[PDB]
Structures are given as C-alpha cells and as structure tokens.
C-alpha cells in the first residue's frame, strides 16, 4: 500500500488528468490484498492507470503450498463459505499438488489436528473409511475429489466456535520406507550368513515373521555361553 501510494504521488498529473485519483486508494488496497508480488502489483497498477475504461483489475494467481492445501481441506477457507467452489478452484489451480498419494497421506496424518483430536470417533471412522475407499480407485480424479469433499464435509458438520486446533505435520511414510530398507539390508545379511555358515535357505517372509526374532535370540544365548548377527533384525520393538 505504501509503495503503490508512492507510485501514485509520483504520477499525480496523469492520474489527476484521467480523474482516477479520487479512486486510487480503493484500487491500491485491492491490489495489495490480492497479491504479494511487488512487480505484478505495479504492473497491474500501470495497466489500470494507463487504461481509460472499466477493465477489471486482474493479477497473477499465486500457488497454494502443501500445508496451505491441507489446512484449506481441514479447516475450510475464509471468504469462501461454499465448499464446492473452494474444492473446485483448489483442483483447477493446484491439480499437481492434489493429484498425489502424498496429499491423501497428509490428510490421514493431519486430520487429528482438528480441535487437538477432541471430536467424535464416528467422524474419524468416516474420514478414514472414505480415504481407504479412495485408495481403491488408482489415481482417478473422482477418488481425490470424493476424498477431499468428504473430509471437508465431515469437518464442516462438526466445526463450531471455541475450537483450538493443533499444528499439522508432514507424513512419516518416508521414515517407514527408510526403516524397511534397513530391515531389507539386515535380512539380506542374515540370509547371506545363513548359507555359507550352515547350508539353509529361508524365505524372506519367515525372516520377517520368526527368524528376525528367534534366530537373534538363539545367537544371543549362544553369545552368552560361547555369530556376526547377534542383535535383533530391525532393532528392538517398543510399545
């Protein structure tokens, strides 16, 4: 607002020539509220000033971030009381972000941040049920549309005043993938040790089920009454 005012007070003659100086303040406020881009704001102001008609003031649309989209899906959007139009514009403008598995994972991870998890379990069951159903459509646009619409409707029917929401976080799936990769490496090492030391071929499923716990236990008992792999595969489990 301050800098657009400076540009106007440096173009008073022309601005005063076209009698647009009695209106410049409202358009400056509108431009400042619409964009956070100084160059685009000044370009739009120049287009409005040099024009001689009733052309609408149009500025470039800024993209919506990941957590911004998550918050818009969860808590809704201010100035847009229509869920349908908000979700529609979200899909048209940010289809690259919304058409991903990471967005559904983010919704699943962050839907508990509404009122610090202090809402009915029926709503949570409905949300996760809809997400699971959407997971059975293999990236069709209808899946994402239905999932986001259902999440928004569920959180709208329970939203009231006096809510103190939490802070969203990125899904921890990559952590689980890294842990699974470490498990795969350890299981490969155990299988490699489990052939040349003693002739035996064990399937990976058995390694994950029984040999990841019982074989390290045996080797630890053997360690105490005395083989390379003595600790549990994947580390110990907790809770």
């Amino acid at each position: 607002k301050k800098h657009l005012k400076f540009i106007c007070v440096q173009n008073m003659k022309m601005l005063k020539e076209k009698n647009k100086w009695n209106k410049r303040q409202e358009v400056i406020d509108y431009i400042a509220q619409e964009t956070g881009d100084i160059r685009s704001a000044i370009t739009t102001l120049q287009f409005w000033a040099t024009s001689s008609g009733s052309l609408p003031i149009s500025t470039r649309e800024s993209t919506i971030s990941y957590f911004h989209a998550i918050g818009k899906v969860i808590h809704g959007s201010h100035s847009t009381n229509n869920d349908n139009e908000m979700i529609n514009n979200l899909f048209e403008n940010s289809n690259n972000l919304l058409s991903k598995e990471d967005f559904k994972l983010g919704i699943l991870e962050n839907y508990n941040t509404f009122n610090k998890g202090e809402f009915s379990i029926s709503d949570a069951s409905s949300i996760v049920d809809c997400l699971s159903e959407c997971d059975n459509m293999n990236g069709l646009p209808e899946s994402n549309e239905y999932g986001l619409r259902e999440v928004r409707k569920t959180f709208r029917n329970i939203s009231k005043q006096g809510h103190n929401h939490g802070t969203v976080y990125f899904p921890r799936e990559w952590k689980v993938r890294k842990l699974q990769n470490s498990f795969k490496v350890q299981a490969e090492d155990w299988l490699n040790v489990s052939l040349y030391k003693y002739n035996a071929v064990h399937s990976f499923r058995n390694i994950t089920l029984e040999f990841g716990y019982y074989a390290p236990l045996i080797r630890k008992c053997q360690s105490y009454k005395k083989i390379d792999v003595v600790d549990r595969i994947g580390g110990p489990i907790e809770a």
């Binding site: 996760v128 071929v201 994950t208």
Partner: protein
Amino acid sequence: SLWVDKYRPKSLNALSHNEELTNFLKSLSDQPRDLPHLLLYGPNGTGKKTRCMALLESIFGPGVYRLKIDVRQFVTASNRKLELNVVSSPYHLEITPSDMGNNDRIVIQELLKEVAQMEQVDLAHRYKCVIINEANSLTKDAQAALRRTMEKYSKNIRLIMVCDSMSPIIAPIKSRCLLIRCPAPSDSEISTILSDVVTNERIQLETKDILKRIAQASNGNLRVSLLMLESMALNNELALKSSSPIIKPDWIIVIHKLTRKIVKERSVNSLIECRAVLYDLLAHCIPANIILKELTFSLLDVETLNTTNKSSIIEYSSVFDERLSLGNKAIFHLEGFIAKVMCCLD
C-alpha cells in the same frame, strides 16, 4: 545350525507326520517321467518345502540338497539393475520371484523361458524341475507368462510351486497343475517330533506336558514350535520346566497390547497411538494382511465383547481385507479397520 534345519527329513521315508501325503508322494515319484506340474498348498510351516525336497530326492537321488547360490542380473523398462538370487542345485532350480516386487514378470519371462527352451541333452534328455516359493506373491502378470511357459515347454522343465492359501493364484495356473494339499500336523505329532529333537539334543525335560504346550501355542507350526523349543532350551540352561514361559514373537505381543488398548480406550488420540504402533509394525516389514489377520483374531479372543461386537469386528475385517487386497497403501485400510472397531465397540 538351528533345530529346524538340523533335523529336516532328507528322504521321503524320513517324513513322519502325514503318512497319507507321503504315500501320495511315493505314488507320484514311482514313475518320474510322467510327473505333472505340482502345486503344494497348506498352512504355513507344515512342511511343504520339505515334502518337495523329499520328492526331488526320491526322483533325482541324493544331491538335490547341494544348493549353490548365484546372483543373476536383470534390466527393467526403466533400465535399472535388479539382482535375483537363484538357489541352484543340480537337477532342480529354486526361484523366489517375490524378491522383486511388481517386477517379477521380467524374471518369470527371462529366467524361466531361458531354461524352458534350453534342453537338457547330455544323447539322454532329462527334465529339470523348477521350484517357485510363495506362488501367491506373483502379480497376475508373472502367472500369465507362467501358464504358456509350462504348457508349451513341458518336455524339458517341470514346475513345483509352494504356497499357502492359493486363492490369489489364477484359474489358468491352477488348472495346469496337480493340487497337493498339505495339512498341518496335530498336536500329538508336533509333540512327538519335539520329543525326538530333545532326545537327540540332550535337553532335560521335566514333563511331556510342556511339549504339548509348545505344540498348542505354535498353532500347528512345526518351524515355530521348534524355534520356541530351542529358545526355551537356551534360555533355561537346557532344562525346561512347567514354569518355563511360553515365548511368542515380539510383534504378536505388540498386536495383543494394541488389542488391549483398542478395547480399553476408544478415542481419536487412541486412534493416533494405534496408528503409531501400526507404523512401527510396518517398519519391521510385517505384511499388512497378516497384521490385520492377527489383529482380528486377537480382538475376537477378548472375553469382554459380546456376540454383536465380534460379528461386527469379523465383518469389518473381511471388508477391509478385501480393500487391502485391491489397495496400494496399507495404512489407510489398517487405520480404517481400527477406527471402525473402536466406533463399534462403544
């Protein structure tokens, strides 16, 4: 070596838990030339692989147990390097295509069509068997290559694939194979096997009841029961008493604790804690199908739930198992099952 491998029956006459299945295997192995393609299906740990190896020993003689392991390289559409381990002995081959994921089709094509066309003349021609462990894990694309591979090249190769719950095996594959059912041993036979093991191992046993307890706790799993036996043998200084605790895997204990928590506290925060526990389970590469199965059958063992709650739990478990079969991310369906259970319990 483990007691599961130390006392593995190396001959068709050394199998002493099913008898009738042994008679059928001997009938098959009397004339190996007309041997069809076999499909061994039965509960996990009953001994299907031992039966396959015993049949192979009956056909090709001793030496099928001299396994050589080599790494063979593959290339996918995106030209990435994949390394499948092929446990190869003379007279037969072992392949686990599930070592690769959806990329097992290229293995079933390259590696198997290589040996199917390649004859085994050395003026005399023999057929070399190929063992496919975990036939269920094939992705309906490996099986489609498999069917024509074994139909057209039957003269040179024979397929013996082992699996449990052969429902995810397509109809063309099932129609092309001889279906061999391998039932799990009863508690008496498991106890007898454990008695032979402890006798050959010089473990001091207080009473024979503590072997029936192992057999009952393993739920008809020979390998699991033998691993429990070795565990309490090496955790009790080779002297087992009735006070010796029945030991169960860590993930089973975690699932039982999760069941207790789900029955006790039913809120969204409890749901988040259950999600954390499920993520920890998945971090240990425990497949989500068996996670859901164990969760369901631990929730059906709680005595505080009436018949309506148990029926709702089993219905939701079936629905979400079908969802998990067709899904891509397991956490959605696991969380949905837990949320439905927590919503129906109250």
